Enzyme design. Sequence first.
Site, PDB file in Angstrom:
ATOM      1  N   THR A 100     -59.600 -18.231  14.464  1.00 17.71           N
ATOM      2  CA  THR A 100     -58.816 -18.155  13.233  1.00 17.71           C
ATOM      3  C   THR A 100     -58.422 -19.550  12.751  1.00 17.71           C
ATOM      4  O   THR A 100     -58.820 -19.970  11.662  1.00 17.71           O
ATOM      5  CB  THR A 100     -57.552 -17.301  13.442  1.00 17.71           C
ATOM      6  OG1 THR A 100     -56.665 -17.952  14.362  1.00 17.71           O
ATOM      7  CG2 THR A 100     -57.927 -15.929  13.994  1.00 17.71           C
ATOM      8  N   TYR A 160     -55.735  -5.716   9.418  1.00 15.98           N
ATOM      9  CA  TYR A 160     -54.702  -6.015  10.403  1.00 15.98           C
ATOM     10  C   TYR A 160     -53.793  -4.824  10.635  1.00 15.98           C
ATOM     11  O   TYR A 160     -53.287  -4.686  11.734  1.00 15.98           O
ATOM     12  CB  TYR A 160     -53.862  -7.227   9.996  1.00 15.98           C
ATOM     13  CG  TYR A 160     -54.502  -8.544  10.346  1.00 15.98           C
ATOM     14  CD1 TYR A 160     -55.072  -9.348   9.363  1.00 15.98           C
ATOM     15  CD2 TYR A 160     -54.544  -8.982  11.662  1.00 15.98           C
ATOM     16  CE1 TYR A 160     -55.665 -10.558   9.681  1.00 15.98           C
ATOM     17  CE2 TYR A 160     -55.133 -10.191  11.995  1.00 15.98           C
ATOM     18  CZ  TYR A 160     -55.695 -10.977  11.003  1.00 15.98           C
ATOM     19  OH  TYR A 160     -56.285 -12.181  11.329  1.00 15.98           O
ATOM     20  N   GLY A 202     -48.494 -20.878  15.913  1.00 16.94           N
ATOM     21  CA  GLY A 202     -47.616 -22.022  16.201  1.00 16.94           C
ATOM     22  C   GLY A 202     -46.178 -21.673  16.498  1.00 16.94           C
ATOM     23  O   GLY A 202     -45.610 -22.154  17.479  1.00 16.94           O
ATOM     24  N   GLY A 219     -42.764 -14.547  15.087  1.00 18.66           N
ATOM     25  CA  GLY A 219     -43.935 -15.049  14.362  1.00 18.66           C
ATOM     26  C   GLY A 219     -44.510 -14.000  13.428  1.00 18.66           C
ATOM     27  O   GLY A 219     -44.077 -12.845  13.441  1.00 18.66           O
ATOM     28  N   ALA A 263     -47.507 -12.506  13.127  1.00 17.58           N
ATOM     29  CA  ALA A 263     -48.259 -11.452  13.802  1.00 17.58           C
ATOM     30  C   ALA A 263     -47.315 -10.498  14.507  1.00 17.58           C
ATOM     31  O   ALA A 263     -47.452  -9.264  14.393  1.00 17.58           O
ATOM     32  CB  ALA A 263     -49.231 -12.048  14.811  1.00 17.58           C
ATOM     33  N   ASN A 318     -58.692  -9.345  19.754  1.00 16.26           N
ATOM     34  CA  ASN A 318     -58.985  -8.714  18.475  1.00 16.26           C
ATOM     35  C   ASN A 318     -60.436  -8.310  18.349  1.00 16.26           C
ATOM     36  O   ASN A 318     -60.710  -7.261  17.773  1.00 16.26           O
ATOM     37  CB  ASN A 318     -58.558  -9.630  17.328  1.00 16.26           C
ATOM     38  CG  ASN A 318     -57.044  -9.732  17.193  1.00 16.26           C
ATOM     39  OD1 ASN A 318     -56.297  -9.405  18.114  1.00 16.26           O
ATOM     40  ND2 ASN A 318     -56.588 -10.194  16.038  1.00 16.26           N
ATOM     41  N   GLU A 370     -40.561  -0.908  36.830  1.00 16.85           N
ATOM     42  CA  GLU A 370     -41.750  -0.552  37.622  1.00 16.85           C
ATOM     43  C   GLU A 370     -42.958  -1.436  37.312  1.00 16.85           C
ATOM     44  O   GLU A 370     -43.750  -1.743  38.209  1.00 16.85           O
ATOM     45  CB  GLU A 370     -42.127   0.921  37.435  1.00 16.85           C
ATOM     46  CG  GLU A 370     -41.159   1.871  38.131  1.00 16.85           C
ATOM     47  CD  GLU A 370     -41.545   3.342  38.009  1.00 16.85           C
ATOM     48  OE1 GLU A 370     -42.754   3.668  38.029  1.00 16.85           O
ATOM     49  OE2 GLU A 370     -40.622   4.183  37.905  1.00 16.85           O
TER      50      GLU A 370
END
Lengths: 427, 427, 426, 426
Positions: free
Chosen positions: A169, A214, A134, A10, A12, A196, A244
């Site tokens: 958003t 960003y 999405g 995506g 991001a 955020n 771990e």
Amino acid sequence: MRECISIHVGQAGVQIGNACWELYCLEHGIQPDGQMDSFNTFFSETGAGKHVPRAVFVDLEPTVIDEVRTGTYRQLFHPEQLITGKEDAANNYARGHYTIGKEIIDLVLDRIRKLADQCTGLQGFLVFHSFGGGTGSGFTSLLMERLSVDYGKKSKLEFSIYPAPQVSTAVVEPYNSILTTHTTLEHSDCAFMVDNEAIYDICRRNLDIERPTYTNLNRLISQIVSSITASLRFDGALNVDLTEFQTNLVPYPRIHFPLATYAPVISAEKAYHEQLSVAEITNACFEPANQMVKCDPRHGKYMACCLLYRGDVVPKDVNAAIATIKTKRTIQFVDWCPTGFKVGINYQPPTVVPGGDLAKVQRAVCMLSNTTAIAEAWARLDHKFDLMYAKRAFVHWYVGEGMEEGEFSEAREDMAALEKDYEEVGV
Amino acid sequence: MRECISIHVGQAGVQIGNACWELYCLEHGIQPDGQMDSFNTFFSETGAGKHVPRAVFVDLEPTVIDEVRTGTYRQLFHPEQLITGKEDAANNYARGHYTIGKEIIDLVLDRIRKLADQCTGLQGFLVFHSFGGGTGSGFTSLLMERLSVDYGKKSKLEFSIYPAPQVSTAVVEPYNSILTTHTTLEHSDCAFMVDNEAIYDICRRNLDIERPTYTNLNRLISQIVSSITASLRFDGALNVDLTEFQTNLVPYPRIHFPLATYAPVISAEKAYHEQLSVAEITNACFEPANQMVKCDPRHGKYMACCLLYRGDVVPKDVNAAIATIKTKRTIQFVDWCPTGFKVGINYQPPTVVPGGDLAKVQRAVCMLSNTTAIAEAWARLDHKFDLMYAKRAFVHWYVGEGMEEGEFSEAREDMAALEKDYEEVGV
Amino acid sequence: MREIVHIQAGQCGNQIGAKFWEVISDEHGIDPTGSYHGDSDLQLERINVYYNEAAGNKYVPRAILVDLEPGTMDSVRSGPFGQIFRPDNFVFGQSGAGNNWAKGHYTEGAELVDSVLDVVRKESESCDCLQGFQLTHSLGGGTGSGMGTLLISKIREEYPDRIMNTFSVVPSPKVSDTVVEPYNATLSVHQLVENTDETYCIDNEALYDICFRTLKLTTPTYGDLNHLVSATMSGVTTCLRFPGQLNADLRKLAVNMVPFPRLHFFMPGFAPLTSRGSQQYRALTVPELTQQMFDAKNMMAACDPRHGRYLTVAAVFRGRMSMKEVDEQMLNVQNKNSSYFVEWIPNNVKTAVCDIPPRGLKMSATFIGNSTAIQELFKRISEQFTAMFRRKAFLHWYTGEGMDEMEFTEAESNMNDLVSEYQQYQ
Amino acid sequence: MREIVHIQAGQCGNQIGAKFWEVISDEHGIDPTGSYHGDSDLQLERINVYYNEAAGNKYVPRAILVDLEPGTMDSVRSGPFGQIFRPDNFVFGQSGAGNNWAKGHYTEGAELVDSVLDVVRKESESCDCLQGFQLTHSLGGGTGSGMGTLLISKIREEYPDRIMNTFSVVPSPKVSDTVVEPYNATLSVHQLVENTDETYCIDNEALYDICFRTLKLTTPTYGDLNHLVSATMSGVTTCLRFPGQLNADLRKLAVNMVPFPRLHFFMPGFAPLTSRGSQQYRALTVPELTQQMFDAKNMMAACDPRHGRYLTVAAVFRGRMSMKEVDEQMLNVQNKNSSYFVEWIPNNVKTAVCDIPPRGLKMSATFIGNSTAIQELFKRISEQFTAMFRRKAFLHWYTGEGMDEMEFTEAESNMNDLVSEYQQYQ
Ligand SMILES: CC(=O)O[C@H]1C(=O)[C@@]2(C)[C@H]([C@H](OC(=O)c3ccccc3)[C@]3(O)C[C@H](OC(=O)[C@H](O)[C@@H](NC(=O)c4ccccc4)c4ccccc4)C(C)=C1C3(C)C)[C@]1(OC(C)=O)CO[C@@H]1C[C@@H]2O
Ligand SMILES: CC(=O)O[C@H]1C(=O)[C@@]2(C)[C@H]([C@H](OC(=O)c3ccccc3)[C@]3(O)C[C@H](OC(=O)[C@H](O)[C@@H](NC(=O)c4ccccc4)c4ccccc4)C(C)=C1C3(C)C)[C@]1(OC(C)=O)CO[C@@H]1C[C@@H]2O
Ligand SMILES: CC[C@H](/C=C(/C)[C@@H]1C[C@@H](OC)C[C@H](O)C(C)(C)[C@@]2(O)O[C@@H](C[C@@H](OC)[C@H](O)C(=O)O1)C[C@@H](OC)[C@H]2O)CO
Ligand SMILES: CC[C@H](/C=C(/C)[C@@H]1C[C@@H](OC)C[C@H](O)C(C)(C)[C@@]2(O)O[C@@H](C[C@@H](OC)[C@H](O)C(=O)O1)C[C@@H](OC)[C@H]2O)CO
Ligand SMILES: Nc1nc2c(ncn2[C@@H]2O[C@H](COP(=O)(O)OP(=O)(O)OP(=O)(O)O)[C@@H](O)[C@H]2O)c(=O)[nH]1
Ligand SMILES: Nc1nc2c(ncn2[C@@H]2O[C@H](COP(=O)(O)OP(=O)(O)OP(=O)(O)O)[C@@H](O)[C@H]2O)c(=O)[nH]1
Ligand SMILES: Nc1nc2c(ncn2[C@@H]2O[C@H](COP(=O)(O)OP(=O)(O)O)[C@@H](O)[C@H]2O)c(=O)[nH]1
Ligand SMILES: Nc1nc2c(ncn2[C@@H]2O[C@H](COP(=O)(O)OP(=O)(O)O)[C@@H](O)[C@H]2O)c(=O)[nH]1
Ligand SMILES: [Mg+2]
Ligand SMILES: [Mg+2]
């Protein structure tokens, strides 16, 4: 060796991945073109000498990956590691899953298999998506499911962009996130979640920056990722392998969500008005506002905590700090866990990029936390979803592509169950 | 070690603090930027070598602290030690307390806690405010109260700007001061009080200066502060720790007010027309006009006196001087205290700043005095308050923000009680 | 055998201690780092009395430094002979006492005292035959006064058959040096009356008088005062460290000096005391020395001994001398002025002598007096106490740490009883 | 004869091991590549105890390095003394354990253990007369804890008549260092109780206390801790490698230290422990050494031995010393404080001595204590275990690898029985 692959999916996720790769290049001495010891955990050893990473880069959005493909960190990447399609889901869970994603997913799987074929001990994965966006929610869920079939014993860690309670958003997040939770749950092992709003708060207070982007956020995330991973690559007093973080953080096999927080996150200005000792750092880690999500952790017992100290670190000091933390009355802990803290101490310090605001520090830490205090956020999300769904807001879009509404109900039930479990744990 | 923190609050307090810090820098060899043995009592030891003080700097007025932040003594300070808000109380006790201060106070407390976290034996505090100024009276009271909850065993010394009987600045002082007295009383240990009229008189006679400023006053105050504190930092024949000024000066646990006076305060001109011997200095200390408040000390029995000799000082001489003082008929003392004098003798002399008028002296003294003679001033203040309050002058301002008028009555009652106690002591 | 453990408590105690260790070091030929550079085997014969031996012919004071107030001891450490002490023998806290006996004796001191006790126990094991403990402190402070008393209590409890002697700096009653001094002094005296075998009472006023009137000196520093104290201290134990004709010892002195168990408060002195400048004007005859010893102006307690009778007196001489001269001198003194020595004890004096003069002198002497006149000192302190306590002045500082009024009263009562007892033998 | 095979398991085990091999190398005059540069024939007499000889007068540790977690062992290899080890003695897998005992003991470890066994067998053939196996591991990890236990089981099965000793790093109960630590520790202890003859229990908390309180040190690193461990380890086997008066041995120590077969958990110590800075302040008498040895603050397990009775104690001295002094010291200790040694065993102590002090010291000593107080350690672990297991917290990670609930319960039961047994002799 302890040698592994990453997944960035995506818009991001891709953005985060860029930052991560930049950080890695800084750390291991690699130049943006692939030229320069233990780097090879990610950068699978190469033909003519120039190193090439092991990351799955996926976006059904062309644009972000197109940008990457004409960037600086460009030839570094393999053409195939970066994947493309045609159009966004548009915050539509029923497109990453079901309709459009079931097409590309095969290709992604193939790529992953190929990458694995270079490992001599594949310890697992790192996955970057968004509880909300999405593509990176439906699609990522699908991918994780697929991986579960093809790699049962291999860890699959996730880095997650949970939506903050107040700020938003795109106004179909409450559906998508819930859907992701429903279908991720049983296929992932760990899901490291960062809000955020919290990050912004940190920037305003700790780093003394009131005009963020960003990019900054991505850099911060990358730092955390580096901290998480550094025991694979470099030497250490105590080495925390990827596996771990299953066993020192998942007290029960549905509770897969830790909060990932970093310190010291202070700029050069009142760094020199500070000592930056180990104890102080530890204290900062357990404070409410320095956390990278919106929980009041004082409202919730800690289940498992895990700390990853980097740089000039003497274990005695760490121990002292931990003892002090234990002593404190406000830092609550569960009835059933005495050995609440897991410690990793690494001889290599963190490394700072040009442009990254966080100044050079001889010592730094990344903390990972499981608590009942995460449940508040979940509850809020559930409430949001319920408010949306009763009047059937935007349901016809997901249903109109390929879904049952009963799925939504199931998801809600799952959430409720999770909440109940958390309550039980608290008891 | 004997290692401690200071508090400078309100405009006046901040000004005083600047001077103090300058003096400290001179004394311990520190350059305005933090570069250069036992300095570390205040200057908590630092990262890269450059020393940073332990002082709480607070002003709800931005302006004064803004000035500091663009001054010479600038990077010396930590960004956080200096605190800011938005607007003055405007001599309004009901804003430092109650309304606006209950907001910042938490931050201040946090800062204090952090500072404490560096001490290996926190002997206590030094607090700078004003019996009169709106911020530094209500707010300071509030702060002291808060500290009382969070540090019960730690001394909290206060440096106080009592308003002189005749001269005034802002015509709501009589309320504010009284309010401060009511709410400070039980939370502070010691309140070292200095008028301004007295200082001016001293300047006119002793220093031969008839055109003073606030700067000069501040410097003088700083000198006194240095004298008070020097036994913490440097070596000595006899070392007076902060906690001694509780036990050698507070004969009863409501009488918390001593008069702070300094000698020799004579310029270079008729310094060379003087010997400046120990006995002479001692004599000067007990004379009426050289005192730094407006009492006629001949009208009032001494309860406890405390002297802090600095420099080339032989104890024999000091003893002789004290004997002489005891012999004098006019220097009255209480029925119940034979051992009236407490002596500190310190091998390090005082140090003189460029611009400070007081010339270099091989030996100097600071005296601290409790007497029934302070009560006159208190009585005057009470009278002023009563005259104001009967016609309800400016009461609606404090009441209009958040107060009961009964508070005023309570304060008056407290004052009366104090007066009665003083009378009893005199008896 | 005959080994002594030294404890120094509080600021005063530490400062005096530093001087004492310098002086003893000099006497035994120990250099500031701890190496021996003597030329006489007499020097090492009984060096064990004060020093332990370590690898490389290193000698270490059997000495413990205690202060709740930190920094004073840091000064000691920084000092020249500071390097001789064992680092593990520095016991210190992180809070002052504010000249508060209660904080030294009950609360803050109680938290530190365990460490001190542990060290003391350790020290005791390196004694072949422990003679006892020697303490240096001050009355009027918090640590030396309160914590000193506390420590003494503990040590007596654990070693009741070893001798407990204290060099205690008391107040100067005509010009007192703190405000709560009387309270502290009174509280300490109570403890010391019960838990020590001998207390040497030194007061700064007397020292200054000595410096000015006798030694013809000016600008005297605390260093100089410490010197004077240290000289007396060293004199006291000379017979444990060295040869002689009649050899003293701690209990021997106690046997001759304490005719009733509670009357063990001594006025120490040294002789000769004349000016440095006017040296040649006088000479060292035993009679002259004794004159100097016995004259009131040459004593270091704040009494006129002529305002009371001597119960007993011990003189300790150093140098090779005619015993005839000594004894005869004593006899003459007693005969001429029999009124100043209580008539119920035949031969109030005692002599001891050691064949070994300290550094410069051919003939030196230490005086230890037990006079009924010392009642004056206690009397004035009690007067001071009463004037304050009847108004409960400054009392909140002590009650706040858990002390009770009744205790104060009892301490006063005991002090008064002491005075009464002294008056009995006057 | 008297040859020992060394195994190091897991991260901790490997790290400690590296230090141990450095120290032993130094002791036997072996340089970092494996050449001998000693000046005494004493050094080589019994070099075979730890080292095999190869062509060109090369000496090779009889040492096996095991870790399922790869990379830790790579660090060892990269290190200075890494080049002394035989490459074929590195046995490693391609997956970590996630601090999971089940993965070390049942599944992942089972896949690697065959190799280790093969190497061990090979090693055994080069023993003239194998004394036994010496293991270094940690409880709280997955490999050292689980796989270590697995390996121990195998080796005992194959060599039941040779001695099995383990230097095991346990948790610090007041501040625990992983989350599943209690589970791991409990699982391991079960195995060790049954399948080893002696286990030296070392805890980092105690080490840090030693460093800070005793040695007066700060900024201590894992390296420094390893050093301390290595010194004890070397001390333990000194009598197999060198001459002396009374010579110890593994089974000899076991014979004197294990009065009931399951009570074989020891608290190791070293003496002297004083500051580097304050060296000259102290000296090396046998009494002082013994004091240091016996004091609780100088032990490396997380007990107050004063909260229990000593069942038995072994002291191993190095240096030429008076046996009279030794024995008499022991006797005095027993007499003075007989309550701290169980009265049902006359002469709870044991002495051994070797004429050969290690590098700097003239006199050094190693302490091995078997006290009923160690029940505390087990008790706390069981408490930790129960709090989690009653809620089945973290259990899925173990059941997923085929472990059963019943096993956990049984392990807890055994631990409790151990505690009970210890309490019996208290
Ligand atoms: C040239 C000469 O002969 O000088 C003498 C001297 O002038 C006189 C005045 C010394 C001097 O003493 C003082 O002036 C003094 C200063 C402060 C406090 C007390 C005394 C002398 O400083 C002191 C010094 O004393 C010693 O050497 C003793 O061994 C003494 N030592 C110390 O106190 C000492 C000083 C510094 C460093 C180490 C030790 C001692 C006494 C008793 C027990 C043990 C040691 C001596 C005889 C002198 C000087 C040097 C001028 C006298 O004192 C002593 C203790 O001997 C003062 O009256 C005596 C008579 C001496 O003749
Ligand atoms: C100038 C001098 O004498 O220095 C000493 C020293 O100062 C002291 C403080 C040493 C020092 O040891 C430590 O400071 C220490 C550091 C971490 C953990 C433990 C101890 C020393 O470093 C350790 C060193 O020890 C040895 O040489 C032994 O042979 C020891 N060797 C090692 O541990 C070793 C270190 C590095 C490389 C190879 C071996 C040993 C002990 C038992 C069994 C086998 C070997 C010695 C005596 C000293 C120094 C050098 C300062 C002491 O320790 C030992 C083990 O001897 C600490 O208390 C003792 C007393 C010593 O006097
Ligand atoms: C026996 C115990 C003893 C008692 C007395 C009174 C003793 C006796 C004698 O000394 C031994 C006096 C002595 O023989 C002198 C006359 C030479 C002389 O020293 O006397 C003092 C005054 C005297 O008191 C009057 C003194 O203070 C003192 O204490 O005296 C001035 C002095 O100026 C140089 C000188 O003139 C007290 O401890
Ligand atoms: C015999 C087995 C043994 C039992 C005891 C209690 C033993 C006996 C003695 O040592 C051998 C004590 C010893 O003689 C001393 C007094 C010098 C000393 O070392 O005691 C400790 C405290 C003590 O416990 C109280 C100690 O911790 C300890 O373990 O003591 C403080 C210490 O400060 C310097 C010092 O004062 C346990 O293994
Ligand atoms: N921290 C961070 N968050 C980002 C970034 N880009 C987007 N986000 C967040 O991710 C969420 C939106 O998801 P995206 O990743 O943009 O959406 P997508 O995965 O491309 O999915 P579609 O665009 O819906 O197909 C929002 O919560 C954004 O704030 C980034 O670079 N960094
Ligand atoms: N000695 C001295 N006194 C000062 C100084 N500044 C102000 N004052 C005195 O302090 C009193 C006024 O209080 P300020 O401190 O100015 O007031 P404030 O604390 O800022 O409070 P508000 O302005 O009312 O919010 C008057 O009595 C002034 O004479 C200074 O620098 N030195
Ligand atoms: N003779 C002597 N008296 C001292 C010295 N230092 C302080 N004093 C005296 O001791 C008293 C003060 O007590 P002090 O020991 O400094 O306080 P403490 O540290 O609380 O015990 C006063 O009477 C001082 O005159 C010193 O070095 N020598
Ligand atoms: N004394 C010591 N303890 C260690 C060392 N390395 C790790 N530890 C401790 O061992 C435990 C962690 O186990 P570790 O051996 O690293 O895990 P493993 O590799 O899975 O066996 C913790 O209690 C650490 O404090 C070391 O070198 N020395
Ligand atoms: Mg997109
Ligand atoms: Mg203002």
